Amino acid sequence: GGMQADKCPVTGATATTARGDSVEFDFFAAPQAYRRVAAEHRADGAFHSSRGDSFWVLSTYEGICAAFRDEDTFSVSRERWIPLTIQGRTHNEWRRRLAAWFTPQRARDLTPAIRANARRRISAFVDRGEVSFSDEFARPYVLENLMLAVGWPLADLDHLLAINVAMIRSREAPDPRQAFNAETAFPALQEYVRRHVARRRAEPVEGDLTSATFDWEIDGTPVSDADRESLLTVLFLAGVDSTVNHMANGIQHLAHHPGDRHRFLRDPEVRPAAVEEFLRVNSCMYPGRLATREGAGGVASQGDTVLLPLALANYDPAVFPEPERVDFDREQNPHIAFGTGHHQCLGAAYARAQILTAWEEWHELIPDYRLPDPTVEPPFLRNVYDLRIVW
Numbered sequence: 450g451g452m453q454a455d456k457c458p459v460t461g462a463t464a465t466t467a468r469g470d471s472v473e474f475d476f477f478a479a480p481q482a483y484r485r486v487a488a489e490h491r492a493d494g495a496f497h498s499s500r501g502d503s504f505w506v507l508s509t510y511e512g513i514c515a516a517f518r519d520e521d522t523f524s525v526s527r528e529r530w531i532p533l534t535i536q537g538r539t540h541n542e543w544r545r546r547l548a549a550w551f552t553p554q555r556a557r558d559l560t561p562a563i564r565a566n567a568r569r570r571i572s573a574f575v576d577r578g579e580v581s582f583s584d585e586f587a588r589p590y591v592l593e594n595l596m597l598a599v600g601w602p603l604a605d606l607d608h609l610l611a612i613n614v615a616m617i618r619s620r621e622a623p624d625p626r627q628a629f630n631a632e633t634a635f636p637a638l639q640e641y642v643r644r645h646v647a648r649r650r651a652e653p654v655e656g657d658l659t660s661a662t663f664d665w666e667i668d669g670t671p672v673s674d675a676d677r678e679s680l681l682t683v684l685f686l687a688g689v690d691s692t693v694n695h696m697a698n699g700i701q702h703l704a705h706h707p708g709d710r711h712r713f714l715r716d717p718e719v720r721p722a723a724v725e726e727f728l729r730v731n732s733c734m735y736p737g738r739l740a741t742r743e744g745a746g747g748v749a750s751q752g753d754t755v756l757l758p759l760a761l762a763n764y765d766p767a768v769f770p771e772p773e774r775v776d777f778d779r780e781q782n783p784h785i786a787f788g789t790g791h792h793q794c795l796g797a798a799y800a801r802a803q804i805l806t807a808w809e810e811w812h813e814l815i816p817d818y819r820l821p822d823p824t825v826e827p828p829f830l831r832n833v834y835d836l837r838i839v840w
């Protein structure tokens with residue numbers, strides 16, 4: 450019968466296959482769970498989940514970066530979302546058209562507005578001594594900033610906020626008093642986007658992103674309404690929650706760790722580096738890719754789904770020594786909280802400006818604050834949560 454199946458017949462070379470059984474791993478898990486499962490099961494840079502359709506999970510910084518940077522091997526095809534699912538020359542064309550609206554210089558141009566927004570909002574609840582940080586401050590703050598950058602009329606903020614919240618709460622028990630719910634939130638967004646395209650088509654506006662797309666060409670022809678609506682939908686879906694939840698996880702840490710709060714308070718020059726360290730620490734996205742050939746990443750088969758969890762890349766101890774430590778003075782922080790390769794976040798400079806500015810204005814008006822029940826170990830904030838801060 451068989452012997453030494455470990456060894457290639459005839460030549461006898463030892464198989465270099467990744468060493469592990471599949472696990473029944475749920476991709477909808479928290480970063481701490483990704484890291485625990487990875488620690489127990491990763492073999493040669495990956496582990497495999499048999500759950501559902503099944504998928505590979507890469508587990509090293511080097512491997513995850515390499516996959517992000519090799520679109521031919523790790524495809525973004527899924528279903529058409531501009532620009533997330535576009536590749537190659539056409540994707541670069543979309544990014545070229547979009548670039549001017551999201552440059553570092555434009556983020557700086559918008560920072561006085563962002564700052565006025567934060568200061569206005571925080572000043573309005575400083576007398577209360579408490580706030581639900583994300584529901585009442587961070588989410589409408591971030592959405593207001595997004596609407597300013599993309600050109601959605603600010604009179605529509607309450608509407609778009611209600612859609613956003615209905616999406617976040619889509620797995621909660623239904624609330625029959627709500628005008629938007631799990632089933633209607635996305636169609637409501639699509640209808641809003643269609644109305645917005647019609648508004649700007651009837652009356653184009655200088656410096657308005659939607660109005661500019663009417664003159665855009667891609668692949669040598671005018672942009673279609675379908676692609677225009679897709680793009681606007683993606684900007685809404687992409688441009689709020691990750692920023693909000695990075696803001697909330699960072700402020701929750703400072704509320705619980707007086708030494709780090711005092712550093713942030715007394716040392717303005719460290720604040721940009723602190724934002725980058727929190728971006729590393731609180732990363733939780735797991736972008737997926739489709740393996741286009743056998744042996745992708747050395748483990749995947751053609752047609753396999755491969756996840757690239759930032760919670761693993763940004764905690765790789767070969768790159769980030771003592772990775773669980775929040776260290777504002779961390780000497781080497783090449784984190785990929787915004788991804789890497791061609792699809793690297795369009796909004797990274799804007800998100801950085803929003804987070805830093807909000808925390809700056811927060812500490813000007815609320816220098817000292819805490820969590821209300823300090824007998825609870827503060828959880829990682831994601832999905833539906835309520836971050837109460839008191840002062």
Ligand code: HEC
Binds near residue numbers: 737797800
């Ligand atoms: C101003 C809008 C905007 C904001 C704000 C924003 N994003 Fe993005 N992000 C995008 C868009 C649009 C893309 C898709 C880019 C592409 O596919 O070429 C993207 C892509 C990404 C990707 C790459 C996904 C992949 O499949 O490769 C990551 C990671 C990411 N964003 C993380 C973040 C994080 C973390 C934050 C907040 C700290 C954030 N983004 C804030 C618009 C935004």
